[PDB]
Amino acid sequence: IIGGEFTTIENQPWFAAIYRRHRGGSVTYVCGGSLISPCWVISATHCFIDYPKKEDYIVYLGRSRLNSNTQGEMKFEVENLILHKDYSADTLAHHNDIALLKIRSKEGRCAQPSRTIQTIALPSMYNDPQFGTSCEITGFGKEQSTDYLYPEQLKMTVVKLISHRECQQPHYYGSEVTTKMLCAADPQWKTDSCQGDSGGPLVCSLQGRMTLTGIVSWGRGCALKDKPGVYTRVSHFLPWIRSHTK
Numbered sequence: 001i002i003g004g005e006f007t008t009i010e011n012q013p014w015f016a017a018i019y020r021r022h023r024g025g026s027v028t029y030v031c032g033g034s035l036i037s038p039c040w041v042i043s044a045t046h047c048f049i050d051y052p053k054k055e056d057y058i059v060y061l062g063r064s065r066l067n068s069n070t071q072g073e074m075k076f077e078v079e080n081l082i083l084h085k086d087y088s089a090d091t092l093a094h095h096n097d098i099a100l101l102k103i104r105s106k107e108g109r110c111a112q113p114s115r116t117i118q119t120i121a122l123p124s125m126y127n128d129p130q131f132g133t134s135c136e137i138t139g140f141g142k143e144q145s146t147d148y149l150y151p152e153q154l155k156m157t158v159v160k161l162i163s164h165r166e167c168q169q170p171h172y173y174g175s176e177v178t179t180k181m182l183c184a185a186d187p188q189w190k191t192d193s194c195q196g197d198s199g200g201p202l203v204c205s206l207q208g209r210m211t212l213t214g215i216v217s218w219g220r221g222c223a224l225k226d227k228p229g230v231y232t233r234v235s236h237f238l239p240w241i242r243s244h245t246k
């Protein structure tokens with residue numbers, strides 16, 4: 001997250017921190033995710049496509065820091081790694097950038113809701129917020145495009161949804177951004193999601209309900225003028241989510 005504010009997991013309790021175990025035992029941060037039901041975390045296929053082995057992943061819930069075992073946090077392994085069959089990546093655009101991770105503790109249990117671990121509601125069909133709506137993003141992603149390290153403390157920011165017609169403008173993304181993708185950015189281009197924030201939530205309050213409207217997917221640079229953050233539009237994927245969580 002470029003700009004914005006440092007936060008804690010109690011403010012973003014649906015946030016899942018996803019890591020990968022390498023040969024030799026080193027563990028590195030991969031992507032963010034969102035808890036949609038006790039056994040299920042939703043993220044982006046691009047985070048996993050190159051290492052599609054469920055055994056490699058570690059998922060934390062209730063974790064506020066990149067290298068601290070936050071009081072009340074829960075550690076999980078991945079029982080099922082479901083990637084979208086029609087996923088693909090162009091130079092910029094990522095297609096069907098959605099993945100499901102069925103989580104399980106070493107004891108075989110799913111998440112136990114608490115003050116720091118909570119689910120996030122899915123949107124309803126054909127009901128996304130109007131353009132101009134303010135939504136929040138959360139992640140352990142880069143604080144500056146030129147950084148190589150990720151921030152130790154969890155960050156959040158607020159961005160505004162951008163219409164498909166605006167995002168398809170020539171100086172924006174043209175025909176590279178599709179109706180299955182949602183654009184969002186800061187009108188002043190000072191704050192945004194960045195590399196490392198992928199798979200994380202774009203949460204919008206709609207009709208008084210906090211909803212998982214998007215999943216961080218892609219973007220040209222970070223907080224770059226006329227280059228919004230591009231998010232998987234969760235409402236389009238409701239039949240796929242329902243079918244793959246059954």
Ligand SMILES: COC(=O)Nc1cccc2ccc(C(=N)N)cc12
Nearest residue numbers: 145193194195217218219221222229
């Ligand atoms: C410096 O360019 C990047 O690091 N871009 C990005 C790489 C990987 C994922 C990204 C996701 C969102 C964005 C964005 N601009 N919001 C940018 C991303």
